[PDB]
From a paper:
ORF8 is a viral immunoglobulin-like (Ig-like) domain protein encoded by the severe acute respiratory syndrome coronavirus 2 (SARS-CoV-2) RNA genome. It tends to evolve rapidly and interfere with immune responses. The full-length SARS-CoV-2 ORF8 is composed of a signal peptide (residues 1-15) and an Ig-like domain (residues 16-121). Herein, we determined the crystal structures of SARS-CoV-2 ORF8 (S84) (one of the epidemic isoforms) and the bat coronavirus RaTG13 ORF8 variant at 1.62 Å and 1.76 Å resolution, respectively.
To determine the sequence-structure relationship, we next solved the crystal structure of the RaTG13 ORF8 Ig-like domain at 1.76 Å, in which the electron density of residues 18-121 can be clearly traced. It is worth noting that there are two molecules in one asymmetric unit, which is different from SARS-CoV-2 ORF8 (S84). Protomers A and B form a dimer via an intermolecular covalent Cys20-Cys20 disulfide bond. Similar to SARS-CoV-2 ORF8, the RaTG13 ORF8 Ig-like domain folds into a “β-sandwich” containing two β-sheets (strands βB, βD, and βE compose the small sheet; strands βA, βC, βC’, βF, and βG compose the large sheet) and an insertion region. However, the insertion region forms a dynamic loop in the RaTG13 ORF8 Ig-like domain, distinguished from the β-hairpin fold in SARS-CoV-2 ORF8 (S84). Unlike SARS-CoV-2 ORF8 (S84), the residues 62-78 loop region of RaTG13 ORF8 is assembled different conformations between the protomer A and protomer B in one asymmetric unit. The electron density of residues 63-65 of RaTG13 ORF8 is unclear, indicating a dynamic region. Additionally, the RaTG13 ORF8 displayed a similar two-stranded parallel β-sheet in protomers A and B’, like SARS-CoV-2 ORF8 (L84). SARS-CoV-2 ORF8 (L84) was the strongest, followed by SARS-CoV-2 ORF8 (S84), and RaTG13 ORF8 was the last.
Author numbering:
A (entry chain A), B (entry chain B): 18 to 121
The structure:
């Protein structure tokens, strides 16, 4: 039920305002199709050497940097941009915030 | 509040939760292309008159009813869904809330 609306210059890099509290841990995902039954694809944990039959790639450099989290300012197409927030490093209790973009 | 996140079953009718305070006046818009520099197109205008210069009518199935405002649960392609909330009937002091959908 929590939503973060942010404005950025379309087609240019955008350092996202992380909506989690500043001392909370944050993990970034795409919820495929913005559907709750669909997978949460974790964004900034890419280890090479996957042999999975399903692999996610970044043709257009949607994710520009992981530190700090920076995206190309563009309409989400695979699904919704979602950050998961926790006081605990192990994410024992967490809340998810969707990040929505208005274009300047 | 700038962002309202709501859940509905995709392609089924959905009565949109008005995120404005219950005693506030509210008008529904599409913001073309989700761009701040684009026009707001007012939805569900009853009749052209002193309060509404132009009646906009969708040619497809996005709007199910205008009383109460009911959509076919989907994200709009023309732009973002925005509600303008005002304590006053003249809409001189107001705030806009963007409505976005998670799909069941
Ligand atoms: Ca922040
Ligand atoms: Ca943070
Ligand atoms: Ca309400
Ligand atoms: Ca209302």
């Amino acid at each position: 039920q929590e939503c973060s609306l942010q404005s950025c210059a379309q087609h240019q890099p955008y350092v996202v305002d992380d909506p989690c509290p500043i001392h909370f841990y944050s993990k970034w995902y795409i919820r495929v199709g913005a559907r709750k039954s669909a997978p949460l694809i974790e964004l900034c944990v890419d280890e090479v050497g996957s042999k999975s039959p399903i692999q996610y790639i970044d043709i257009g450099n949607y994710t520009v940097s992981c530190s700090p989290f920076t995206i190309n300012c563009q309409e989400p197409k695979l699904g919704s941009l979602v950050v998961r927030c926790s006081f605990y490093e192990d994410f024992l209790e967490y809340h998810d915030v969707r990040v929505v973009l208005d274009f300047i």
